[PDB]
Amino acid sequence: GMTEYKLVVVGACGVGKSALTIQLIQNHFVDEYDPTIEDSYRKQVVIDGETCLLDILDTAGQEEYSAMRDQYMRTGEGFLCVFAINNTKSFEDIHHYREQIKRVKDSEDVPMVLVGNKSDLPSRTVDTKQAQDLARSYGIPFIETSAKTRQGVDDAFYTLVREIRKHKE
């Protein structure tokens, strides 16, 4: 029946992986409180007229390169690669996350979206243009989000579903 899309949210500590997921799942953002675990969350959404189910893994915990961890990530059909626009190191780590995705999926062509989060903040250190140019050289979409104001959140996840759909055809 209803198509399920397995999405994986990856990126450095503190960029807003959990805050983005919770906005989508529970429509809220509390400045003071944040998830502390890795977990996956299911939500039925309508995207371009298609009722579907998103199964979203919000990654956390420890970096680890075991066969078990690799195989878990390999079930992801699409990946949000998140950095924070006020955190240059988190932007510099994006190439590494992409490379691990391509390694476990064993493919040059994995549905992926680059997400620049915390667009509400004024202390910007990553120009929008530099992130656009990076996404263009990878050949993937780039979306600026604010998990605090919810700006661009649906766009990020829905765009990733659209990349998965193109891949399955």
Ligand SMILES: *CCC(=O)N1C[C@H](C)N(c2nc(OC[C@@]34CCCN3C[C@H](F)C4)nc3c(F)c(-c4ccc(F)c5sc(N)c(C#N)c45)c(C(F)(F)F)cc23)C[C@H]1C
């Ligand atoms: C904030 C929570 C936290 O402490 N985490 C640990 C680290 C930050 N996580 C994480 N880190 C990296 O790289 C970190 C770093 C710095 C030390 C050396 N190392 C390499 C670069 F220098 C950057 N990489 C992560 C991942 F690659 C992945 C991951 C993503 C996709 C994928 F297919 C696979 S397969 C596989 N095994 C791993 C791993 N590990 C990945 C992940 C993720 F959680 F699995 F997605 C985390 C990485 C983030 C969090 C957990």
Ligand SMILES: Nc1nc2c(ncn2[C@@H]2O[C@H](COP(=O)(O)OP(=O)(O)NP(=O)(O)O)[C@@H](O)[C@H]2O)c(=O)[nH]1
């Ligand atoms: N202003 C602002 N703050 C944000 C935004 N998204 C997340 N934050 C803040 O940034 C911090 C980290 O958020 P969180 O969602 O825990 O990030 P994470 O990537 O899941 N961290 P971890 O990797 O440790 O699980 C929190 O204080 C959160 O309130 C955003 O769009 N705007």
Ligand SMILES: [Mg+2]
């Ligand atoms: Mg988190």
